[PDB]
Design an enzyme around this catalytic site. Structure first.
Site, PDB file in Angstrom:
ATOM      1  N   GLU B  60       0.803  -1.228   0.000  1.00  6.79           N
ATOM      2  CA  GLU B  60       0.000   0.000   0.000  1.00  6.79           C
ATOM      3  C   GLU B  60       0.845   1.291   0.000  1.00  6.79           C
ATOM      4  O   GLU B  60       0.459   2.276  -0.619  1.00  6.79           O
ATOM      5  CB  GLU B  60      -0.933  -0.006   1.192  1.00  6.79           C
ATOM      6  CG  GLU B  60      -2.261   0.651   0.938  1.00  6.79           C
ATOM      7  CD  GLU B  60      -2.538   1.763   1.918  1.00  6.79           C
ATOM      8  OE1 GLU B  60      -1.957   2.859   1.726  1.00  6.79           O
ATOM      9  OE2 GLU B  60      -3.318   1.532   2.888  1.00  6.79           O
ATOM     10  N   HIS B  61       1.995   1.256   0.673  1.00 10.76           N
ATOM     11  CA  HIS B  61       2.944   2.368   0.662  1.00 10.76           C
ATOM     12  C   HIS B  61       3.780   2.427  -0.611  1.00 10.76           C
ATOM     13  O   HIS B  61       4.351   3.486  -0.928  1.00 10.76           O
ATOM     14  CB  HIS B  61       3.891   2.261   1.844  1.00 10.76           C
ATOM     15  CG  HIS B  61       3.360   2.851   3.099  1.00 10.76           C
ATOM     16  ND1 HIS B  61       2.310   2.293   3.793  1.00 10.76           N
ATOM     17  CD2 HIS B  61       3.755   3.931   3.811  1.00 10.76           C
ATOM     18  CE1 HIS B  61       2.114   2.976   4.900  1.00 10.76           C
ATOM     19  NE2 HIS B  61       2.950   4.000   4.916  1.00 10.76           N
ATOM     20  N   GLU B 137       4.740   6.205  11.100  1.00 11.46           N
ATOM     21  CA  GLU B 137       3.277   6.053  11.217  1.00 11.46           C
ATOM     22  C   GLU B 137       2.861   5.141  12.373  1.00 11.46           C
ATOM     23  O   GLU B 137       1.775   5.289  12.886  1.00 11.46           O
ATOM     24  CB  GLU B 137       2.639   5.576   9.909  1.00 11.46           C
ATOM     25  CG  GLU B 137       2.727   6.597   8.795  1.00 11.46           C
ATOM     26  CD  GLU B 137       2.158   6.119   7.476  1.00 11.46           C
ATOM     27  OE1 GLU B 137       1.957   4.895   7.312  1.00 11.46           O
ATOM     28  OE2 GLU B 137       1.868   6.990   6.602  1.00 11.46           O
TER      29      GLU B 137
END
Ligand SMILES: CCCCCCCCCCCCCCCCCC(=O)OC[C@H](COP(=O)([O-])OCC(O)COP(=O)([O-])OC[C@@H](COC(=O)CCCCCCCCCCCCCCCCC)OC(=O)CCCCCCCCCCCCCCCCC)OC(=O)CCCCCCCCCCCCCCCCC
Ligand SMILES: CCCCCCCCCCCCCCCCC[C@@H](O)O[C@H](CO[C@H](O)CCCCCCCCCCCCCCC)COP(=O)(O)OCC[N+](C)(C)C
Ligand SMILES: CCCCCCCC/C=C\CCCCCCCC(=O)OC[C@H](COP(=O)(O)OCCN)OC(=O)CCCCCCC/C=C\CCCCCCCC
Lengths: 53, 446, 61, 423
Positions: B60-61, B137
């Site tokens: 996803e990153h 994060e």
């Protein structure tokens, strides 16, 4: 003072709670019958016959 | 005129056609000048191993940072220049990549999604840059008491199961995950029978299927010939996690019973019961006059800064219950008032409050399905969970069927004398002992 | 004993506190009979004939 | 085959009121009464009155009690929302199609028959402190309050939140006064989605014929300038730099809106270097730490503020600001390609269209259009408006900002944050 408690919700609220209120009465009855030894009620019970003449 | 009933029939049928790949391709058409297009994937954290726990979250990153046809910048530059927005998300069960763009831009939109989903340039320099980004994060998420308590609730309710794991994974797995680890999950999961191409707006289902064959066809040849993965059931545990921190000013508590899962018809009645209890927050204007007894007792007695009910669904399982935030001295009363409402509903739900619950739910369902993004999301998710789009009239049908008896039968099935999963965080000295919480799951009078 | 006897005892009687209570009071009455004389019968065996209940017929009109 | 879409009905009544409807055949319905009654119409004697008013939407009316408004709307599962801006208040009401009638009635009572009871107002005063505390936990809210207090000597200087000294000081009479002189026909618009034009026109004719207050949309924003500085400690620094631009509706504003996309609004891609964002690329060149920068664009009835907004570490603040500022300077100096503007056009056009695609954003736009313009301008011609902006206008917008008397708000550790003086 009691007219506030009459309406369709309370009709549903009474019906919702009646199987329970009936079963607590059965508890109280059996409970009172068993505790005092109500041979009046208990003579007609197919195993509890402690009055065995 | 137009009756609420008639309006539901006017919403056009979500049209479904399938590619030879197994890529289900679906659309809901409208006269809109814009659209949302996306790929929904049957992958999350529930598919991960413990040893590759942040893998989906890592892709996803990496997904937007370069392909074989569009190295580095190129993708952004293309999407940005046509005025489109490109987003992604990952739950424990589902991963989605979608584009909000002009309807005329649908040819490039599908094209870019194809490149993102099939040709991810997992360049080792970028995976290392993402390592720091994800780790940063992780520290960021730690400060969100709500994000924590739900991860904690997942961790304790699904003790020892893949569902106990978070989407982002633990720190060590972020620190040590390799390109191989990443490619392997990618190749094992981003397979066509587990992908749905969804679109909504000024479309033509004909034009979308054309594009789906144009850009996604390229997953044929041979498929699934060595190994196939199907999900194992996840044991729910009635348990407690208490993270005691007397340096945070408000307590977060999330309490839940086991829910049935996506497919189950009795999610409707649960949602209705949840609607009745609802949700409160200190910025609500209603206060004392709010219908939900919990909301009104919360407001009057300021028992709470916020509470919300939830019915989180996973395949064959879920989390049903409420989460709240409050002052140290109000945890006990919040629990009592909450559990008392669950029991009230379990034993003595009345007809009119069930109408309000149904009414809130029809309003929620119709308000949510507003615009290309929410509807495109609904097509993608629905096909992945229910195997079809459940039309709005069917939802109305299934909502209208719920009466007081349904609520109390269904609430009892799930809540009555069941073991909660309990997660607490912050100033929690006053958080009730598990036995006490578990005792609130029944009534001696009933 | 197919879905377990304890499981069917829970779903039929133990679930609601009303039927749970009713099972106890009905059970307390049954148990009182099977225990009073059932333990008296064991008290008989340790005192086989040395009790007046056994002697009885020796002095009868 | 979907349904062939209906057309929006529009009507100005002789009394100045505006009605707009669209039968979108939606399963739900939305009605918004929009009023020229935002924060700007407050004066130095009644600040925060329109905040408490915004908070008062379910207090007791003639025709519907507090308890009824709540339980009545909740029974049908609808909403009553109120959104203030510096220019408008907007009372919005949502429900299923079959229930438009009860919510309309509630709407009309809240807006036209509010009673503002002494004790009910008394009990609601503390919500101002919570409401203010919950907004002000975004560093951006105080920055934009302060930015406005410094820009204008006047009406747009007023904040959408009530000054602390006023909490518990707003009188029941002040709200009665605010309603009687702002919630009037000529300052109003009744917008309906999933409703019919005759019905809106009927309720407008029956219930919304009020007039006996102020007239001017321009009690008149006197732009002034200067800066406000708030030492904070606070993790990272927030700074907005701004000059007077263009009143909403004018051709100039459209140039400013394009300038905003040449330089950079919010992101488009989840976690991206924001490649097309010329402001972001400019700061990034010599700042190698966490930061944010966007063009800020505020458009009002009679003034406007354009510039940029920055989030940065305490020590990088001045570098981030100076880099952003110089980037604007290069566009004023002439350094802007045709495809640069073309992309900004596409970013704006697409963004606008997306902004109205749901019924919430649609109703708000038709509402704000009705008040600012007295017209409904379809997307087709808004896109034509945007297209008419030439490269030379966007340059002229940048030229106006650079050479114009600035306004600045900032909060954090201001140790290394410049002063207009030093820009
Ligand atoms: C005639 C007039 C009618 C009387 C009506 C008043 C009833 C009030 C109360 O007594 O009933 C509570 C209770 C209702 O409890 P509930 O529906 O689970 O929830 C109430 C609240 O949640 C209660 O709050 P909670 O969620 O924190 O509950 C925990 C609490 C925990 O309390 C503990 O049980 C107390 C133990 C103290 C003993 C310490 C000594 C150590 C040695 O348990 C209950 O409240 C019951 C307490 C029983 C105390 C014994 C009564 C003495 C008088 O009534 C029971 O149903 C009674 C059934 C038992 C009697 C047999 C039936 C015969 C008929
Ligand atoms: C004070 C001096 C005396 C010293 C005594 C010391 C000796 C110890 C004896 C003390 C009594 C302790 C009782 C044992 C504790 C068991 C807990 C019991 O009270 O059950 C509770 C509930 O109470 C019972 O349900 C009530 C049953 C009623 C049975 C009748 C009792 C006999 C009294 C007769 C009644 C008639 C009245 C008399 C009329 C004359 C909670 O049950 P729980 O383990 O949490 O299970 C939850 C219930 N579920 C299954 C529905 C979820
Ligand atoms: C007249 C005098 C009578 C004398 C005759 C003797 C009669 C026998 C005594 C009857 C005792 C009945 C015990 C019933 C207690 C029971 O109801 O408690 C239930 C409770 C259920 O627990 P939860 O899971 O938390 O459920 C609630 C959450 N929904 O279980 C109990 O803990 C176990 C039962 C322990 C029995 C304790 C009974 C003692 C009560 C006497 C009070 C004396 C205190 C003295 C102070 C006096 C001030 C009133």
């Amino acid at each position: 003072m009691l007219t506030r408690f009459l309406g369709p919700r309370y009709r549903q609220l009474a019906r919702n709670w009646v199987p329970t209120a009936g079963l607590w009465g059965a508890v109280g009855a059996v409970g009172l019958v068993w505790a005092t030894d109500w041979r009046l009620i208990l003579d007609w019970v197919p195993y509890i016959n402690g009055k065995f003449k | 005129t137009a009756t609420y009933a008639q309006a539901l029939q006017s919403v056009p049928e979500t049209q479904v056609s399938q590619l030879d790949n197994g890529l289900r391709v679906a659309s809901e058409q409208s006269s809109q000048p814009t659209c949302t297009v996306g790929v929904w994937i049957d992958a999350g954290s529930r598919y991960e191993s413990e040893k590759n726990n942040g893998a989906g979250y890592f892709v996803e990153h990496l997904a937007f940072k370069g392909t074989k046809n569009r190295p580095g910048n190129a993708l952004e530059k293309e999407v940005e220049s046509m005025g489109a927005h490109l987003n992604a998300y990952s739950t424990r069960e589902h991963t989605a990549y979608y584009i909000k763009a002009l309807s005329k831009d649908l040819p490039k939109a599908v094209e870019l999604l194809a490149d993102i989903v099939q040709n991810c340039s997992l360049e080792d320099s970028q995976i290392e840059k993402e390592r720091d980004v994800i780790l940063q994060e992780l520290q960021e998420n730690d400060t969100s008491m709500r994000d924590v308590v739900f991860n904690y609730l997942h961790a304790t309710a699904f003790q020892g199961t893949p569902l106990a794991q978070s989407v982002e994974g633990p720190s060590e797995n972020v620190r040590k995950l390799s390109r191989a680890d990443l490619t392997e999950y990618l190749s094992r999961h981003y397979k066509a029978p587990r992908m749905v191409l969804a679109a909504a707006g000024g479309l033509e289902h004909r034009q979308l299927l054309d594009l789906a064959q144009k850009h996604f066809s390229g997953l044929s040849g041979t498929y699934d010939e060595d190994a196939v993965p199907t999900l194992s059931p996840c044991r729910f545990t009635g348990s407690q996690i208490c993270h005691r921190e007397d340096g945070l000013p408000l307590a977060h508590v999330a309490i839940a019973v086991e829910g049935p899962g996506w497919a189950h018809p009795d999610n409707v009645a649960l949602q209705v019961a949840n609607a009745i209890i609802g949700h409160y927050d200190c910025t609500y204007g209603g206060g004392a006059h709010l219908s939900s007894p919990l909301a009104s007792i919360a407001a009057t007695n300021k028992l709470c800064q916020s509470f919300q009910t939830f019915n989180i669904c996973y395949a064959d399982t879920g989390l049903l219950g409420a989460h709240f935030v409050c002052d140290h001295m109000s945890i006990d009363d919040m629990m009592f008032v909450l559990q008392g409402q669950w029991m009230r509903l379990c034993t003595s739900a009345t007809e009119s409050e069930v109408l309000r619950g149904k009414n809130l739910l029809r309003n929620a369902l119709v308000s949510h399905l507003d615009g290309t993004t929410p509807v495109c999301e609904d097509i993608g998710r629905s096909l992945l969970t229910y195997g079809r789009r459940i039309p709005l009239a069917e939802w109305e049908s299934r909502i209208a069927e719920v009466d007081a008896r349904v609520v109390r039968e269904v609430c009892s099935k799930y809540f009555y004398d069941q073991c909660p999963a309990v997660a607490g965080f912050g100033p929690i000295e006053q958080l009730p002992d598990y036995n006490r919480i578990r005792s609130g799951m029944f009534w001696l009078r009933f | 004993v197919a879905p377990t006897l304890t499981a069917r005892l829970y779903s039929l009687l133990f679930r609601r506190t009303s039927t749970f209570a009713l099972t106890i009071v009905v059970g307390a009455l049954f148990f009182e009979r099977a225990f009073d004389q059932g333990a008296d019968a064991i008290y008989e065996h340790i005192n086989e004939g040395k009790l007046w209940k056994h002697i009885k017929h020796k002095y009868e009109n | 085959v979907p349904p062939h879409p209906q057309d929006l009905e529009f009507t100005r009544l002789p009394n100045g009121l505006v009605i707009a409807s669209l039968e979108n055949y939606a399963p739900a319905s939305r009605i918004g009464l929009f009023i020229k009654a935002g924060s700007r119409y407050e004066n130095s004697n009644n600040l925060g009155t329109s905040h408490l008013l915004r908070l008062a939407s379910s207090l007791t009316t003639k025709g519907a009690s507090s308890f009824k408004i709540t339980r009545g709307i909740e029974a049908v599962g609808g909403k009553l929302s109120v959104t203030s801006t510096r220019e408008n208040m907007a009372y919005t009401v949502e429900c299923l199609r079959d229930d438009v009638d009860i919510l309309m009635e509630f709407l009309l009572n809240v807006t036209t028959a509010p009673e503002f009871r002494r004790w009910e107002v008394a009990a609601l005063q503390p919500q101002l402190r919570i409401d203010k505390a919950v907004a002000l936990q975004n560093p951006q809210a105080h920055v934009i309050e302060n930015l406005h207090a410094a820009a204008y000597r006047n009406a747009l200087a007023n904040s959408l939140y009530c000054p602390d000294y006023r909490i518990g000081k707003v009188t029941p009479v002040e709200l009665h006064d605010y309603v009687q002189n702002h919630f009037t026909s000529a300052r109003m618009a009744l917008i309906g989605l999933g409703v019919s034009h005759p019905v809106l026109k009927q309720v407008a004719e029956q219930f919304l014929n009020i007039r006996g207050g102020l007239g001017l949309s321009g009690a008149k924003a006197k732009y002034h300038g200067g800066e406000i500085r708030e030492q904070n400690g606070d993790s990272l620094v927030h700074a907005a730099l701004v000059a007077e631009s263009a009143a909403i509706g004018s051709a100039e504003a459209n140039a400013f809106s394009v300038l905003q996309h040449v330089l950079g609004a919010g992101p488009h891609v989840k976690r991206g270097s924001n490649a097309t964002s010329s402001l972001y690329q400019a700061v990034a060149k010599g700042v190698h730490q966490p930061f944010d920068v966007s063009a800020f664009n505020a458009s009002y009835s009679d003034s406007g503020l354009f510039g940029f907004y920055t989030i940065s570490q305490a020590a990088s603040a001045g570098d981030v600001i100076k880099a952003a500022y110089n980037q604007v300077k290069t566009i004023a100096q002439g350094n802007l390609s045709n495809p640069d503007v073309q992309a900004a056009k596409n970013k704006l056009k697409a963004g606008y269209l997306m902004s109205v695609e749901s019924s919430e954003g649609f109703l708000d736009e038709v509402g704000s259009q009705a008040l600012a313009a007295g017209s409904y301008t379809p997307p087709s011609t808004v896109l034509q408006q945007i297209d008419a902006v030439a490269d030379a206008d966007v340059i002229n917008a940048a030229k106006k900002f650079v050479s114009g008397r600035k306004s600045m708000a900032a909060s954090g550790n201001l140790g290394h944050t410049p002063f207009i003086d030093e820009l």
